[PDB]
Amino acid sequence: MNPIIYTTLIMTVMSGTMLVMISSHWLLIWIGFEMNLLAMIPVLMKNFNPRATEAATKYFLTQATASMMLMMAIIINLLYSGQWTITKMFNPVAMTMMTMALAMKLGLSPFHFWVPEVTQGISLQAGLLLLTWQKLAPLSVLCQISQSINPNLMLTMAMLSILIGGWGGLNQTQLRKIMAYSSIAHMGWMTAVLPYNTTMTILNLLIYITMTLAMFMLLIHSSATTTLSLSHTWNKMPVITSLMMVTLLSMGGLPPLSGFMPKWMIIQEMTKNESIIMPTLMAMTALLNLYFYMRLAYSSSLTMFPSTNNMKMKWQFEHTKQMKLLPTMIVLSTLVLPMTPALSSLN
Amino acid sequence: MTMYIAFILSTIFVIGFVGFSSKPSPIYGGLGLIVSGGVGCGIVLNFGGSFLGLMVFLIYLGGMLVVFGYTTAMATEMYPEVWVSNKTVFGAFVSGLMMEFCMVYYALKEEEVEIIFKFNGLGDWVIYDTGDSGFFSEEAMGIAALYSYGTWLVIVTGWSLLIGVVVIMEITRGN
Amino acid sequence: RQWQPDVEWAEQFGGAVMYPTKETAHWKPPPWNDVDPPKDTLVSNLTLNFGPQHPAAHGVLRLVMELSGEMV
Amino acid sequence: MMSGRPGRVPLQFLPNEARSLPPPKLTDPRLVYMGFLGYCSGLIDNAIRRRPVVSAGLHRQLLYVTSFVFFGYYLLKRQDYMYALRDHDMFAYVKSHPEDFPEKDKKTYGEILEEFHPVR
Amino acid sequence: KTLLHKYSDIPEGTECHRKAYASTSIGGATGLIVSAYSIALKPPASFLEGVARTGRYTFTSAAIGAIFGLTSCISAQVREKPDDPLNYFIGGCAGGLTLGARTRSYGIGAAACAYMGLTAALVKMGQLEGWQVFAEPKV
Amino acid sequence: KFYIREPPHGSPDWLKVGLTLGTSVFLWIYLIKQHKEDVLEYKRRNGLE
Amino acid sequence: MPLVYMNIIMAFAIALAGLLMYRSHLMSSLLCLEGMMLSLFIMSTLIILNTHFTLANMMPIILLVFAACEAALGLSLLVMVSNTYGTDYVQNLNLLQC
Amino acid sequence: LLDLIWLETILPKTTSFIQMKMSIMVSNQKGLIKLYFLSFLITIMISMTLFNYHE
Amino acid sequence: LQYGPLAFVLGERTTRKLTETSKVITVDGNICSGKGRLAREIAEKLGLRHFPEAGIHYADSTTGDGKPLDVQLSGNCSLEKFYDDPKSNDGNSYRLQSWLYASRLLQYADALEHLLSTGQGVVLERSIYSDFVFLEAMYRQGFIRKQCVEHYNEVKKVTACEYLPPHVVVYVDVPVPEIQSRIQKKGNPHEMKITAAYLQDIENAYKKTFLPEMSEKCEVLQYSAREAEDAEKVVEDIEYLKCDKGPWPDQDDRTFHRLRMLVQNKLEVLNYTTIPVYLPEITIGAHQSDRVFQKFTELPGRKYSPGYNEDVGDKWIWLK
Amino acid sequence: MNIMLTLLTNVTLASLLVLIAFWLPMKFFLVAITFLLFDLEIALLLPLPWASQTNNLKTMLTMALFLLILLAASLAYEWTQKGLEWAE
């Protein structure tokens, strides 16, 4: 795009979510969700390729429909209390309505089939924006109305994300598809802890955000979208693959890496809430995520893969993009476990 | 009769939705919404709300829906299905008929319909309030606050529409 | 020397899915440039038949010409 | 949880009550950890950009260490304030609700009959 | 959850007919849900194949519920154990064996026995105890 | 010289680097100053002063 | 509660079913999505006018001016899948199988 | 018979086979919006009626 | 400042620099047809930027100190060996051709960068749109087999797609027997024992594919050697043509900014050259590739980023 | 009622005299979408007449004129980036 015109589209959506996290009025929250969608569509179709045209259509139809379902959740609450402020909802079906409506905007439960296809069609740079920033807007509302949430309603949504995210992730080939499924699996973790204490929901969000940028911008540097294409990068840029491995271990969740940050506190939090069978399933099924993390780890750096003659030409030229914030993002996503008591700052 | 006129219109409103919810030919589906759009204003009109109702005619029925069917006109295949055509379309229509008949029958006999929302089945008119409005229309004086109280609304809705104008070109540019 | 993966090991990862299945046995790999292949032309250049109906053609002036809706 | 306790001036990274806490000493083990992370950021920054790791633009390393320590130091103040705030309002509720936290009675182990299960 | 309430209200072992009808109702309802998804995400050729998929899935699920409720109840009062988890353990394998015959594979039948037998004991395990799967946010 | 083209980072960007030390010393001196007033304020408010 | 509101409430539901079920054409789906905000508009105006919530008259006008922005985006996307695929049938939109 | 035939096929291989089959089920979709949205309608219906969350 | 998007906003627009003399003229032809000679004459006549034929060691000339590296370290393919025996089991046939196509791709990119930046017209022999004639000749003559063709044209699809065809292409069509008439005089041992059919297969693949697949996108004007010495005529036709029927004289400034985004990122234009498709003749094994990379790394200058190698005398490394 | 009676009578007259006449004997899209966005922006300032009589019309002056310059701004961006010069 024209650099100045892509800039405003990048940050009209920055402001769209910014409205949601600051609006105290129900209508205004929908307003920010509208600008969220209205600015997301062009970015997904920066390159104008039939994958993007499909990805935009699938993304738009899903988000628009969820937005409409959100409105009548707003109307029903108005119909039964006449209150436009955001507080605990004053009617059950309205509460049930927006939980599904907000879920589809985020996408954890069966409302998740759009997530893989949309990111697969669109470019990697727009992939991180969809998988990182487009999740704060739905989560901000959920953390706001967590008091009125239905404990049964959310938790079954939470597992169905991690089980689906855990299972289907094994069979995926395209790195964007794997990243999307891990995002679905990660999405389940904080949504499950959302009814109990939203501090860990935000804590899981921040850590997951840090891990995803480290994942996406490294892949952008690799200029690769397939496992085999990522496999070749061992020879040209061995350092990146080594960093690819450490963030994969981190975002797998193994201690003392920062992936043990959210789970451990989340496991601890629900255990204080007498829910003990619930954490065990999520912790155990989290290994499904680790398997295709291992699969990517094996093919990236741990075992070198066959290369091509033409890539000797690649060594002759240096990189151009400075991939801003990459060094600090990696370190902030690997060795922050000893700073765990910093979670008290959020609350 | 005349007491149930809002109910009568509301009934046509529902069956009007079945017209386009059944997903017929896009032109014919638009027409089914056009009547549905038309009657819905009358429901609003009977409750007051002249200006809010009039928009449904102007900027939606004569507005959004005009370019809607206009797009269906130059798009779509050379063989537009006539409402009967596919048996599913008529199956959907009769399906919509049985939902409104069962509730309305249930509404006017037992008056204790509890489907999702518990709603008691009385006439439309037992909900209106009382009191004189002086010399100012409540609807007119409410949305006239767009420029006296609608501060943050105008700033945001105006900004998005400008982004609406830029997003539509960027998608339609073709790179 | 230490054993390293070979092409047969690599082609195992090279399928459209890690785990083959007859449903996905025909899913072709995505284009590397992410560019799906264009289809053929989808043009609507109708060749208008001016002439022997319109006084606009002043009479017997059959014209054959194609246009992009308006541009001849 | 916090969230909306009495007195919650929003977007206040350091409420005035935090000034009544012992400030984090510059030699804090937590604080120097922020410095260590800054160094690791500097090493990665040179590593990613094909630079001679340690001896490669030490000015960038200084900026990374300074930013991490400074951003760290304000974090511990908020970290200690909220942690102290959690216990402060805690220590007053028990006083206001004494019957909600009844005190146990002195019973030495000489009277407590803990069952002795033999082990074989 | 009135449908789930039926199984809980009837005492274990006693009123085997009521337990069997309630248990197969739970299985049949579950079979409806999965079959409805199966047609949705993976459509069959026509409607006749659609009901064919529903017929198989519902019959399997209803059979598992019927055999589990029957075996669990008939084992309870026969053994005079209205609390032992074993009363559900052989119930899980009863469904496990029932599934194995439904898809005609010995290996999947043994695995279903082992997995359902464990879970059925585990589901019973929480019934005597205070185990909660959807515990309310006390803290 | 090796490289035919003068390289992007071959010439030290003296304006940029001197700025970074400028922030580094500014960031430190504020940190030192911040700790003293915090210590003094805690010394005063909590009754020890 | 008056039957005119339940008439509106199903109107959302029948519109909701049409949007989700799909038959062939994205035009119909876009039409179904418009009945969504339509039935929302009468429902919003009906409650707000009944309760004399004067400032709340804001929302009806604000509701559809932003709902119409969906049409500005939704209609545009359709023509592009119409330009490339031909007919805008949802069945054509299956390239992103993986 | 015991070590690497049965003990290796009860815990490790059976779990791997179960995950493999389920991973096939979840990943193998059709990419059709009609089928995806139909699933959404069912989920909406079960949630509002059959999951009993409303009650 | 570089062409980072900030520079576009506060200034530089590509369209300002472009003038009439901003073509991408390529002078193609058969072997030893004077296409390099004719391209030099045309470029110096119009004062354009002539680019010599992209050889196996052209990439080395574009980086480092312009010193051709060792053949194993800079392509693992010798053209002379291919002329000596193309059917060699080492796969020198397709390996040389595939690397040459990448060399042309890098050559084409540098010409595009100079044209977009300076605005001066560029000239280069052959093209990335014309290297297919050799492999198609290399196919019908049995030098390669089907798998090499599939990889090459797929690389053409994934690389040449975002490279529009030049304004005008010059084709000097010397007859094949006449090319034979000069090659005995040339006396380069490898290129003597060419197959007459192969050079015949150079000519026809040039004939009904090059111009026809280039005519619809650009003007194709054709001569022979007798007009190569007569370059004063081959240049006035360039003056006469309007540069019509070409996708260059319609693009706006937005596309040019996008084009400069691609070209200035050298690895980006090379990213789709190294497709993970594993052709046996070009796939370097893990151990050999690792050793070769270690050989590349120990080379002076290549150890670190440009301007960051104290081995070559880069002072102030501690404060770069 | 009177309104319903008027429209009903008009339809019958049109219907009656129709019956006696039957038994007795991207550019195209762009103009649509640009109108749609302008029309929606037009509906914002329709309540202007009564809004002109608000007790804080100074704030009305800044913001009623706001929408009007945005109408110009939307057209201005449309005009400069081709836009109203439709594809031809």
Ligand SMILES: CCCCCCCCCCCCCCCCCC(=O)OC[C@H](COP(=O)(O)OCCN)OC(=O)CCCCCCCCCCCCCCCCC
């Ligand atoms: C938590 C558990 C552990 C988690 C992390 C595990 C990481 C490894 C796991 C396996 C990774 C995959 C297999 C190996 C991949 C290797 C990747 C790679 O790029 O290797 C080759 C590469 C060659 O090195 P090169 O880039 O040329 O740089 C040399 C130094 N200039 O090598 C490199 O580029 C590596 C360069 C390393 C530079 C190290 C610099 C050390 C500096 C020490 C400073 C000490 C200061 C002390 C101060 C004391 C007083 C305060």
Ligand SMILES: CCCCCCCCCCCCCCCCCC(=O)OC[C@H](COP(=O)(O)OCCN)OC(=O)CCCCCCCCCCCCCCCCC
């Ligand atoms: C005391 C109270 C309870 C009393 C009754 C006992 C419990 C209820 C009955 C048993 C429920 C669990 C057993 C599974 C039931 C569903 C079986 C089913 O769907 O079978 C069809 C199919 C398996 O065959 P397939 O892989 O399709 O291969 C053939 C293809 N032509 O299925 C599949 O392919 C998909 C895999 C099965 C469906 C998903 C999982 C369904 C079960 C989830 C847990 C249900 C728990 C119910 C009880 C507690 C809650 C009320």
Ligand SMILES: CCCCCCCCCCCCCCCCCC(=O)O[C@@H](COC(=O)CCCCCCCCCCCCCCC)COP(=O)(O)OC[C@H](O)CO
């Ligand atoms: C590879 C599979 C596993 C291999 C073997 C691992 C070890 C086997 C047992 C696994 C134990 C996991 C759960 C233990 C976590 C701590 C539980 C604990 O401390 O005991 C509680 C036991 O309570 C539980 O219910 C804990 C879970 C019991 C088992 C059910 C879940 C675990 C089994 C299924 C998941 C793991 C198996 C793999 C599935 C794919 C006590 O709480 P309570 O019930 O007394 O609470 C007070 C009151 O009574 C209210 O309940």
Ligand SMILES: Nc1nc2c(ncn2[C@@H]2O[C@H](COP(=O)(O)OP(=O)(O)OP(=O)(O)O)[C@@H](O)[C@H]2O)c(=O)[nH]1
């Ligand atoms: N195998 C192979 N050789 C190529 C390819 N492109 C160019 N060459 C070789 O490039 C060399 C130089 O081209 P020639 O035409 O012989 O060069 P020249 O003798 O200077 O003559 P002119 O090009 O007419 O100036 C020849 O040995 C060609 O075979 C290719 O795609 N494959």
